[PDB]
Amino acid sequence: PSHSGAAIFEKVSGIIAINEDVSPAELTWRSTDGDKVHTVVLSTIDKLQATPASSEKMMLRLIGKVDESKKRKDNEGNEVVPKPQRHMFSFNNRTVMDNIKMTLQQIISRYKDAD
């Protein structure tokens, strides 16, 4: 079990598994019971997030692709960038987080190296 770890979503603990059988490596969260599911495409994931063993809180997150071809402010008068859609997850182990954090990155660079 390398590219797959039990990740939490919406307060529920499911199963995070990277679909490396398709063109663009994806990330599919399949609940433990099978009542909750979620899909994530690393192709859009601009950045990755993971709480190292140094962090008492074990939780992972992925930054999705936004759009820097519009630009705007925060309604106050500060030119900022549209918040990128990210998927926040929660892990319950030190090794589990490493399984995804170390595996996801494998897909991350998969786009940078090519791009």
């Binding site: 950045k47 990755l48 962090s55 809180k57 991350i108 940078k112």
Partner: peptide
């Protein structure tokens, strides 16, 4: 300040 309870990872291009 969500960095104290979360670390950063290799992000896309910037500079």
């Amino acid at each position: 300040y969500d960095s104290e309870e979360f670390e950063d990872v290799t992000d896309g291009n910037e500079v």
